[PDB]
Symmetry: C3
Subunit: 144 residues, 3 copies
């Protein structure tokens, strides 16, 4: 028998694996989403608005309010938060119009879009809304 | 500089090392060839499903799950790690899909999601080990 | 001085990216494009999600263990570091070759049992903007 050091509970493993493993910037983004706040999201889809196909790239200005260190990595951060099931995308929010415009004007986003258009000629921007997912909320609650 | 044995160890580690007891047991069951009921919530309707928003299974004791509270989290992880697939509806899982659809946690997740995604749809699916899951299992058991 | 946030991100990948995946990213970062076969769900009521991907980038990319190509592709796509574009006429022979490879046909046969409308898409593997950015950070 060897139990002096404790094997962690499922709960603990879940929060270590999905939240403690986040980079500080990712964690700050999730924090900003945790009270239900919604942010502007631009999603690049492989096809046009009459046949969207798959999600290729995501961009937001939520990093600014969230206080992230390196806003240059926002698309990388969002890819991870989505891949991990921690956030969701929903439809356009009229009140975020100004934010979409700020995002669409960003030079890094425009660069990414131009790279993707070379080979995906029908690529389209879709204005969406970023929120915490049920799974992200469940994990957040376990952690707190 | 990385050797082949180190690549293999890194692959096994990165996909399999963080599993809970429940997940390790479920994956073992799936590696035997067993399949279980899966209920998936999609952001769009049946002709344009969009993105996966939530997955639920009543796998329970038969799959070795102690903590039914975390089944959506476990499925989320196992899919993210490429370890499992969702195949089509299986008739023989009929009564399990009914159990899933009745479940309280499932229904709550659905209602939350519906607030902001009103075209949301439910699909009955079948959870099985993926080809990558099978390869990794074998690499791991060497 | 490198920003903290950059170090954290780079370290994540240094701990999880294999030599072979690193070499594959590098080949792609040059602008190289490879044959990709994608098995996906062919039911009109599914999202048509990817079930398996295969390529013969192989020696071209400097892959030491071609046994692991499907695992590498799964990881590179999950991490958003590569994209799949349309069929490239130039790669026709490569597509024919991939379609006949053992590992591909085995995965295909496994999946076919349970996914009778299993479909195959011939596509082209390229780096994504995220892949360019990360690979630049890491190098």
């Amino acid at each position: 028998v060897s139990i002096e050091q404790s094997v962690p509970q499922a709960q603990t493993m879940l929060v270590e694996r999905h939240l403690a493993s986040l980079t500080g910037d990712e964690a700050r983004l999730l924090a900003a989403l945790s009270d239900g706040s919604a942010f502007a999201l631009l999603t690049l889809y492989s096809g046009s608005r009459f046949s969207r196909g798959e999600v290729l790239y995501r961009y937001s200005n939520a990093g600014r309010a969230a206080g992230i260190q390196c806003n240059d990595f926002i698309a990388l951060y969002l890819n991870h938060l989505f891949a991990q099931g921690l956030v969701i995308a929903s439809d356009f929010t009229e009140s975020l119009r100004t934010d979409y415009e700020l995002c669409e004007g960003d030079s890094d986003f425009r660069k990414a879009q131009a790279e993707l258009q070379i080979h995906l000629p029908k690529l389209s921007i879709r204005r969406e809304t970023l929120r915490i997912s049920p799974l992200g909320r469940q994990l957040w609650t376990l952690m707190t």
